[PDB]
Write an enzyme that holds these catalytic residues in place. Structure first.
Site, PDB file in Angstrom:
ATOM      1  NE  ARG B  19      11.772 -20.451  28.158  1.00  0.00           N
ATOM      2  CZ  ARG B  19      10.861 -19.569  27.752  1.00  0.00           C
ATOM      3  NH1 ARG B  19       9.567 -19.803  27.949  1.00  0.00           N
ATOM      4  NH2 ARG B  19      11.243 -18.456  27.139  1.00  0.00           N
ATOM      5  CG  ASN B  37      11.113 -19.772  31.656  1.00  0.00           C
ATOM      6  OD1 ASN B  37      11.327 -18.860  30.856  1.00  0.00           O
ATOM      7  ND2 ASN B  37      11.996 -20.733  31.907  1.00  0.00           N
TER       8      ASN B  37
END
Ligand code: K
Ligand code: K
Ligand code: K
Lengths: 90, 90
Positions: B19, B37
């Site tokens: 990320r 996620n």
């Protein structure tokens, strides 16, 4: 850095000029390797060159020519073998 | 031109700084959207901007940060919604 990517492209990817288009795009970006249609209806390709260039072609492959509808791409990174030029194979 | 891509990234993609890395890469390329996620272990993202830049980010996503092992990416093209800036969401 030179990288090698082995692709498997799925979806509505055959009979839409995908092979010709990937070759055209590959030459423009300066990527080496090959592309071909498989009997299961998917497309297989090997991309080799500068990671920036290869990644750009991978991204494009998710779009493909106008009539293509790519639903998924499976990539496998491998050690470069010295591919030169991009061709359409059987 | 401006395009919008909805991604689903699979493989060893969580707990590897994916990320953070995608956000960094996105800002560098000038792509807008978000990443996060999901409980099934996959990564979900929205990329919006000039097709050349979005494709570049999608290609990168197949490599991801050093520890990442992307086995598959599912893309879905949609109509842009005006995303601005790239953020990490929940
Ligand atoms: K097909
Ligand atoms: K298309
Ligand atoms: K990696």
């Amino acid at each position: 850095a030179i990288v090698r990517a082995h692709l498997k492209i799925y979806g509505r990817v055959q009979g839409v000029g995908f092979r010709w288009s990937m070759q055209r795009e590959a030459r423009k970006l300066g990527v080496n390797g090959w592309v071909r249609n498989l009997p299961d209806g998917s497309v297989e390709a090997v991309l080799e060159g500068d990671e920036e260039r290869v990644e750009a072609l991978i991204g494009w492959a998710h779009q493909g020519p106008p009539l293509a509808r790519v639903t998924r791409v499976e990539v496998k990174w491998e050690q470069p073998k010295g591919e030169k030029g991009f061709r359409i194979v059987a």
